[PDB]
Amino acid sequence: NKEMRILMLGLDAAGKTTILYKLKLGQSVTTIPTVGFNVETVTYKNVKFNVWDVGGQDKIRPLWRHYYTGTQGLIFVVDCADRDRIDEARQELHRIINDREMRDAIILIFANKQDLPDAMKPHEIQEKLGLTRIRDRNWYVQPSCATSGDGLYEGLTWLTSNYK
Amino acid sequence: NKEMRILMLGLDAAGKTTILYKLKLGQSVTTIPTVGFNVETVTYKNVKFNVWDVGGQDKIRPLWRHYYTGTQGLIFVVDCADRDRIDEARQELHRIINDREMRDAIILIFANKQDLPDAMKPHEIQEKLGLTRIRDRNWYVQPSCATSGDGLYEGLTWLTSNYK
Amino acid sequence: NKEMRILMLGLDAAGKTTILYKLKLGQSVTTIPTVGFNVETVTYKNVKFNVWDVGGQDKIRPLWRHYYTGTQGLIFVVDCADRDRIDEARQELHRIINDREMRDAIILIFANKQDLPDAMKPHEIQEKLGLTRIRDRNWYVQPSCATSGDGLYEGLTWLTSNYK
Amino acid sequence: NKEMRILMLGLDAAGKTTILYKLKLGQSVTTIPTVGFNVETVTYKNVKFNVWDVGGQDKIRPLWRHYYTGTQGLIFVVDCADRDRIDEARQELHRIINDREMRDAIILIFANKQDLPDAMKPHEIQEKLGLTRIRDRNWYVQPSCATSGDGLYEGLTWLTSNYK
């Protein structure tokens, strides 16, 4: 019986709630923007995941500071078709991961909405996010389509196996 | 701790091995046609599934008779694009489910390969299989695309919840 | 604890699956047109509800007769905006409730999709379904909007209060 | 209980991911090109292998220097059919093995894709990589086919035998 605490952060339109509920229930759901946070538990292999879905609306950005404590892995969900805000995404990612508490956290970049006609590929995303500047911890980029569940469990497996 | 035994049967090119290993490992796999059988264990919600993948090649069709015993649910995987063998699929389904041992088995029709240009919808599948003649047990048709994992866990959840 | 068996019947596009999923999960689930049926358990106050969700296609109408046995309450879901087929809805309802097994069942009329631009009002539903001529049993009409959850728990409470 | 740390480096289209997954799962899998890296554990004989699988894109080559520390063996995977770019592999291999930390690592040259119609033979690979001029360490060239497990376990055995 193993346990791991995961924090889900990112800008709006990233699709974190869809990811979390497709993991838990297995079905796609229609969502109302979260003004606080959601806590769901997902069991996969032999490890119990306590996943925290903190909302990404601009009015509750400072709320992220209260859920860094005790985090083992960070899932930064990115809208791979929202090219206009990838700079803000990069800024937020590097503001999160360079704190004192998040130093030991595993960084998983979850590129969602790969089915869109103008979707950005994982390499262009690792370029835009400046991920090549992260050299002291494990990180990975997983393309996905959340409405179908394409790539969720593979990223969860990567989070499970790369925890040391 | 609950347990359930599942038997996977169907014609060749149905994609049962791809389904089983996309459930077990999480990745799409390259396969060689099984001349015997494969056994994998997949725990999902709270129930431990022992899934039996018996090959569907013509030369090992009589092998199906040795794995009816103790079956709680049957997954009949159907190629929803190969229209030319849906009659043999119907024949085999009704030969399986009308045995004495398989009377208490739950019937899940798994229409695979939905992304093909001439894929049959579940309505045409229920018309070609004659599933309306099954009126003494629970049954359900689930369209899927096994390479992406689209709809596998939905069918697994249906098998879990409809066992009474 | 107390138990009650409920059968959900209705035409296509009625929304029975959405109602059941909203009652069970609290989420608005994106659904796929179903062939076959589901069985789900919902606990509300102190009563355990075993709800049967049978499809509404024309080719699976005869399957309704094999799940009448033991029914305590019937939920007849009606698309309150499909004025062109309220007569078909009336035909189906009167064929159901005038059988031998369903005569002791409590009848709840569930007018869904109340927020549509041309939605019918409950009085028009009563007049079109011919419920105004039913004087020999306990029935009640409840409008609803299943995606938001409005009207669902009121109808469930009415079914609970009238079952003794 | 023996342990050994192995670092897998190479150019694009080398096939390191397929090799690692054939070693770990025993089954060839469909792969997505990584831009980060994986860490996987493979147990073979009596020795536990901690294998590092780092991507080989040009923009992530500098990340290799932060995983040299503690290396006991280096697996340099070469596309034996890419005759045009074997000089780049030679340059990179000589830049790796002549560093301060990687000087004491056991070098295994893994020529993958041996079944291709224009595949190079191990002698040609020795001559092209300049390994014939390396007289100060243990090294070994081996052809392989990752999709079938050809030569993977033999190379792992060679790495095991030469590590003391």
Ligand SMILES: Nc1nc2c(ncn2[C@@H]2O[C@H](COP(=O)(O)OP(=O)(O)OP(=O)(O)O)[C@@H](O)[C@H]2O)c(=O)[nH]1
């Ligand atoms: N094409 C496509 N769109 C998606 C996918 N997942 C989510 N969306 C879109 O995401 C939008 C909904 O946003 P949310 O589900 O609320 O995402 P969120 O980040 O959790 O929102 P907040 O909780 O307010 O931060 C919908 O318009 C969907 O169309 C996907 O996998 N594919």
Ligand SMILES: Nc1nc2c(ncn2[C@@H]2O[C@H](COP(=O)(O)OP(=O)(O)OP(=O)(O)O)[C@@H](O)[C@H]2O)c(=O)[nH]1
């Ligand atoms: N497009 C598509 N093709 C699939 C899918 N699943 C399986 N296939 C095809 O199925 C073929 C392989 O057959 P198998 O997966 O081995 O099915 P099988 O009946 O278990 O074969 P044997 O065990 O050898 O008898 C491949 O050519 C795949 O292209 C799928 O989800 N989508």
Ligand SMILES: Nc1nc2c(ncn2[C@@H]2O[C@H](COP(=O)(O)OP(=O)(O)OP(=O)(O)O)[C@@H](O)[C@H]2O)c(=O)[nH]1
């Ligand atoms: N606006 C609105 N639409 C709804 C609501 N509930 C269901 N729908 C619509 O109903 C359609 C889906 O039909 P289903 O949920 O599958 O109903 P069903 O009777 O179980 O369908 P079948 O099983 O194929 O007979 C979708 O297009 C929804 O838009 C609702 O509460 N509000």
Ligand SMILES: Nc1nc2c(ncn2[C@@H]2O[C@H](COP(=O)(O)OP(=O)(O)OP(=O)(O)O)[C@@H](O)[C@H]2O)c(=O)[nH]1
């Ligand atoms: N024929 C053949 N092709 C192979 C073999 N191994 C790998 N490939 C090919 O290699 C390609 C996949 O590239 P990867 O194995 O992911 O190489 P990579 O650069 O390490 O990818 P990343 O890990 O994401 O960086 C596929 O197109 C395969 O066809 C092999 O053993 N035989």
Ligand SMILES: [Mg+2]
């Ligand atoms: Mg939003």
Ligand SMILES: [Mg+2]
């Ligand atoms: Mg085959």
Ligand SMILES: [Mg+2]
């Ligand atoms: Mg339904």
Ligand SMILES: [Mg+2]
């Ligand atoms: Mg790799």
